[PDB]
């Protein structure tokens, strides 16, 4: 019940799940807290301790702005942090099966949130189900987000960038040294994450410093080649002094600017984060990954194209309606409380919100490819198109392109297309299979029959959990026991993927081919 780690001794707690027991270690620190002088830089090695650490409750979430656009609405507040915010937040969690396993495959989860939000404490990231059903060990960590974690003056150790990525990486190192004492196999470690977390997974594939810290990778609705995924160094530094003039920390010795930024309380840093870009976006990564030259040594699209990444198996996938979630965060004519039927001109106004610094002809190119309807007169035409426009551009096509380029270098890749709409999804029905609402199925939440999910969702979650675990343990996401569809490798020629839903899991080819060619061949030119 008490585990001796290579820097201290931690105590956990027992949980009863499905007539069994899971040992949970909540909130274990993996770094000296990045407070005071340590704010904005790479995490430092946590030094030894003497007590028995009582890791029996989620630790603090990292500082972050909160989605306040729907106060009291579970669809929005589900994602807001559910522990205290604090700069002292570099902690992790461990779920081990009871009784303690011997050489268990370890799953490391990295949450999403546009690199500005998110926390491991979330209800839909509970790894107790996974530990019980599949007797894998589940780990998740808190990493700094927003400017406190991704402010960048490139070169400057006082603020080099990618600190939150380096946070993640130090947690992977902690698993390498300590997960053996928990009965886990450091030689069988699968990273998985969602959206921004999924982009981080793909970045750990490029980053040499992480190659020795995991074996395989799963990417859910995200990859680094997504337009929101990596910030330039041009706009990065523009974004730091814009934050310095907003805080009155404009100096000219870049190190002395940082010292000024450290005696500002976290709330003032959070407040100015928004106004740092002139024309924001529902998907505006104001402070995100950069080519720091330390974690990310080159422009990631070049590393990808030229095969400069860890060779291993990936599992990639997207949801049917990735885009809809963002339409009600600014797009005109949209709301979560009506059918959101928009017209042609509400659509065109919606493009300017999602593509603000894009030419007039560029906006017209998007309109021409998505408003040549399979047929006119349907009232949802413009509503559905703009959802797809945001989905195809920001998630679906970059994930597909990432998978093709990765597979061309000879590794097994598996692609899925999640198209089940949760029967408990709070948002309306026109928003479809929303971005983020496969996570509960991955973590096995429909397995708790007390949780209001239908039987079919329990079956679908049960198979997904099996497929995910098999991929983690054996590199192949099959469900061999029940007479279920086999999941084929994604080859760059045939481009086979598997659909996931309650009815049928069918095998199809070349997902969103016409739409994705537009986004990946002729739109990057504008
Ligand atoms: C982790 C996750 N998985 C599925 C969904 N989510 C959360 C989420 C949030 N938003 C739009 C609002 C935006 N947050 C982002 O995370 C941007 N990403 O690009 C934001 C910025 C600052 C302050 C409050 C909110 N859309 N989904
Ligand atoms: C850490 O926890 C120790 C034991 O906690 C208590 O006993 C266990 C078996 C559970 O029943 C738990 O809910 C109880 O609170 C304490 O004796 C010790 O003081 C704690 N240390 C610190 C620093 O909080
Ligand atoms: C860089 O930032 C410049 C300043 O932006 C303006 O001032 C900041 C403090 C914010 O309030 C912002 O909303 C304002 O627009 C921009 O004028 C400039 O376009 C940015 N980009 C470049 C490449 O210089
Ligand atoms: C766990 O499996 C790895 C696989 O190579 C092996 O090298 C290691 O010795 C095993 N350890 C235990 C404790 O079973
Ligand atoms: C900036 O200030 C720091 C701290 O005073 C100093 O070490 C450094 O040399 C300065 N750089 C320049 C270019 O003046
Ligand atoms: C396989 O089907 C049985 C019923 O025949 C069910 O109880 C079990 O949970 C299923 N397993 C998986 C992994 O889907």
Domains of the chain and CATH, by start? 1-526 (3.40.50.1820)
Minimal-distance CA residue to ligand 4 atom 3: 187
C-alpha 125/C-alpha 462 separation (Å) is: 16
Kindly state the helix (H) or strand (E) to which residue 22 belongs, with its residue range: strand 20-29
Minimal-distance CA residue to ligand 6 atom 1: 482
Q: In the numeric block, which tokens belong to residue 190?
A: 């699968």
CA 505 to each of CA 213, 321, 327, 483: distance values in angstroms, whole numbers, following the listed order: 33, 18, 29, 12
C-alpha 393/C-alpha 402 separation (Å) is: 13
Which candidate, 219, 58, 211, 214, places its Cα nearest to that of 142? Answer: 58
Residues near 368 by beta carbon (within 8 Å), at least 6 away in sequence: none
Residue 185 CA: nearest ligand 4 atom is 1
C-alpha 290/C-alpha 216 separation (Å) is: 23
Q: In the numeric block, which tokens belong to residue 170?
A: 């130090």
User: 66 alpha carbon to ligand 3 midpoint, in Å?
Assistant: 24
Method: X-ray
Q: Which spans in 55-124 are helix H?
A: 74-77
Task: Please work out whether the CB of residue 283 comes within 6 Å of at least one atom of ligand 1.
Answer: yes
Residue 466 CA: nearest ligand 6 atom is 13
Minimum-distance ligand to the CA of 251? 5
Task: Please work out whether the CB of residue 388 comes within 6 Å of at least one atom of ligand 6.
Answer: no
C-alpha 192/C-alpha 222 separation (Å) is: 11
User: 41 alpha carbon to ligand 3 midpoint, in Å?
Assistant: 25
C-alpha 160/C-alpha 2 separation (Å) is: 38
User: 463 alpha carbon to ligand 6 midpoint, in Å?
Assistant: 8
Which candidate, 324, 350, 109, 114, places its Cα nearest to that of 227? Answer: 114
Which residue positions form the known binding site for substrate?
Answer: 113-114
195 assigned to active site? yes
Minimal-distance CA residue to ligand 4 atom 14: 103
State phi, psi for 193 to the nearest 5 degrees: -160, 175
C-alpha 487/C-alpha 505 separation (Å) is: 9
235 assigned to active site? no
User: Which burial class, exposed, middle or buried, applies to 169 when counting CB atoms under 10 A from its CB (0-12, 13-18, 19+)?
Assistant: buried
Structure-derived torsion over alpha carbons of residues 366, 372, 375, 378, reported in degrees to the nearest 10: 40
Task: Please work out whether the CB of residue 181 comes within 6 Å of at least one atom of ligand 4.
Answer: no
State phi, psi for 413 to the nearest 5 degrees: -130, 145
Task: Please work out whether the CB of residue 79 comes within 6 Å of at least one atom of ligand 1.
Answer: yes
Task: Please work out whether the CB of residue 478 comes within 6 Å of at least one atom of ligand 6.
Answer: no
User: Which burial class, exposed, middle or buried, applies to 46 when counting CB atoms under 10 A from its CB (0-12, 13-18, 19+)?
Assistant: middle
Task: Please work out whether the CB of residue 466 comes within 6 Å of at least one atom of ligand 6.
Answer: yes
User: Which burial class, exposed, middle or buried, applies to 410 when counting CB atoms under 10 A from its CB (0-12, 13-18, 19+)?
Assistant: exposed
Task: Please work out whether the CB of residue 281 comes within 6 Å of at least one atom of ligand 1.
Answer: no
Outline where DSSP puts E strands in 111-215: 137-141, 184-194
**Is residue 304 helix, strand or coil?**
helix
User: 6 alpha carbon to ligand 2 midpoint, in Å?
Assistant: 22
Q: In the numeric block, which tokens belong to residue 22?
A: 């899971």
User: 68 alpha carbon to ligand 1 midpoint, in Å?
Assistant: 11
Do 189 and 48 form a contact (C-beta atoms < 8 A)? Answer: no
Kindly provide the b/e burial profile for residues 101-118, where b requires at least 16 CB atoms within 10 angstroms of the residue's own CB: beebbbbbbbbbbbbbbb
Which residue positions form the known binding site for tacrine?
Answer: 79, 435
State phi, psi for 357 to the nearest 5 degrees: -95, 35
C-alpha 248/C-alpha 411 separation (Å) is: 50
Minimum-distance ligand to the CA of 53? 2
Options 435, 440, 457, 463, the catalytic residue: 435
C-alpha 314/C-alpha 276 separation (Å) is: 35
Sign of the dihedral through C-alpha 180, 183, 187, 191: negative
User: 251 alpha carbon to ligand 3 midpoint, in Å?
Assistant: 17
User: 457 alpha carbon to ligand 6 midpoint, in Å?
Assistant: 13
C-alpha 287/C-alpha 270 separation (Å) is: 11
Do 308 and 206 form a contact (C-beta atoms < 8 A)? Answer: yes
C-alpha 338/C-alpha 281 separation (Å) is: 22
Which candidate, 12, 46, 14, places its Cα nearest to that of 171? Answer: 46
Residue 254 CA: nearest ligand 5 atom is 1
Q: Are strands 2-5 and 216-220 parallel, antiparallel or unpaired?
A: unpaired
Do 23 and 13 form a contact (C-beta atoms < 8 A)? Answer: yes
Which residue positions form the known binding site?
Answer: 79, 113-114, 435
Q: Which spans in 355-500 are helix H?
A: 360-370, 381-391, 397-407, 439-443, 455-474
Q: In the numeric block, which tokens belong to residue 150?
A: 């991704």
Q: In the numeric block, which tokens belong to residue 265?
A: 């309380």
Do 318 and 395 form a contact (C-beta atoms < 8 A)? Answer: yes
Which candidate, 196, 164, 161, places its Cα nearest to that of 89? Answer: 164
Minimum-distance ligand to the CA of 482? 6
Structure-derived torsion over alpha carbons of residues 168, 170, 173, 179, reported in degrees to the nearest 10: -70
Minimal-distance CA residue to ligand 5 atom 5: 256
C-alpha 314/C-alpha 317 separation (Å) is: 10
What one-character DSSP code corresponds to residue 31?
A: S
C-alpha 147/C-alpha 34 separation (Å) is: 13
Phi-psi region of 5 (alpha: psi -120 to 50; beta: other; left: phi over 0): beta
Residue 242 CA: nearest ligand 3 atom is 9
SS3 content of the chain, % helix, strand, coil (to 5): 35, 15, 50
Options 76, 140, 188, 195, the catalytic residue: 195
C-alpha 488/C-alpha 502 separation (Å) is: 19
Options 322, 384, 401, 479, the catalytic residue: 322
């Amino acid at each position: 019940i008490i585990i001796a780690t290579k820097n201290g001794k931690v105590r956990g707690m027992q949980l009863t799940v499905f007539g069994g027991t899971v040992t949970a270690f909540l909130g274990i620190p993996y770094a000296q807290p990045p407070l005071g002088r340590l704010r904005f830089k790479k995490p430092q090695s946590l030094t030894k301790w003497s007590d028995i650490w009582n890791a029996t409750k989620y630790a603090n979430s990292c500082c972050q702005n909160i989605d306040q656009s729907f106060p009291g609405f579970h669809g929005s507040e589900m994602w807001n942090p559910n522990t205290d915010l604090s700069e002292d937040c570099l902690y992790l969690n461990v779920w081990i099966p009871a009784p303690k396993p011997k050489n268990a495959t370890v799953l490391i989860w990295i949450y999403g949130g546009g690199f500005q939000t998110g926390t491991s404490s979330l209800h839909v990231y509970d790894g107790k189900f996974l530990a019980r059903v599949e007797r894998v060990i589940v780990v998740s960590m808190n990493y700094r987000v927003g400017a406190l974690g991704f402010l960048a003056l490139p070169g400057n150790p006082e603020a080099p960038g990618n600190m939150g990525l380096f946070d993640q990486q130090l947690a992977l190192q902690w698993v390498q040294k300590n997960i053996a004492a928990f009965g886990g196999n450091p030689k069988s470690v699968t990273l998985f994450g969602e959206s921004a977390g999924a982009a981080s997974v793909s970045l750990h594939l490029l980053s040499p410093g992480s190659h020795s810290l995991f074996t395989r990778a799963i990417l859910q609705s995200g990859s680094f080649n997504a337009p929101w995924a990596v910030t330039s160094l041009y706009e990065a530094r523009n974004r730091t002094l814009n934050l310095a003039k907003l805080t009155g920390c404009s100096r000219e010795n870049e190190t002395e600017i940082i010292k000024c930024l450290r005696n500002k309380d976290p709330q003032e840093i959070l407040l100015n984060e928004a106004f740092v870009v002139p024309y924001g976006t529902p998907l505006s990564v104001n402070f995100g990954p950069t080519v720091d030259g330390d974690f990310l040594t080159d422009m990631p699209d070049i590393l990808l194209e030229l095969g400069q990444f860890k060779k291993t198996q990936i599992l990639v996938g997207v949801n049917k309606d990735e885009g809809t979630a963002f339409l009600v965060y600014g797009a005109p004519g949209f709301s979560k409380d009506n059918n959101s039927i928009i017209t042609r001109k509400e659509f065109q106004e919606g493009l300017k919100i999602f593509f603000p610094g894009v030419s007039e002809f560029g906006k017209e190119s998007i309109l021409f490819h998505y408003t040549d309807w399979v047929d006119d007169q349907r009232p949802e035409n413009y509503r559905e198109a703009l959802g797809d426009v945001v989905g195809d551009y920001n998630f679906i096509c970059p994930a597909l392109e990432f998978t093709k380029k990765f597979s061309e270098w000879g590794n097994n890749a598996f692609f899925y297309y999640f198209e089940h709409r949760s029967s408990k999804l709070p948002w309306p029905e026109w928003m479809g299979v929303m971005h983020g609402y496969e996570i509960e199925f991955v973590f096995g939440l429909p397995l708790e029959r007390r949780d209001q999910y239908t039987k079919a969702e329990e079956i679908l979650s049960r198979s997904i959990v099996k497929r995910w675990a098999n991929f983690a343990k054996y590199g192949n996401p099959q469900e061999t026991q029940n007479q279920s569809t086999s999941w084929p490798v994604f080859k760059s020629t045939e481009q086979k993927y598997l659909t996931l839903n309650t009815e049928s899991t069918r095998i199809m080819t070349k997902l969103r081919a016409q739409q994705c060619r537009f986004w990946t061949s002729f739109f990057p030119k504008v």
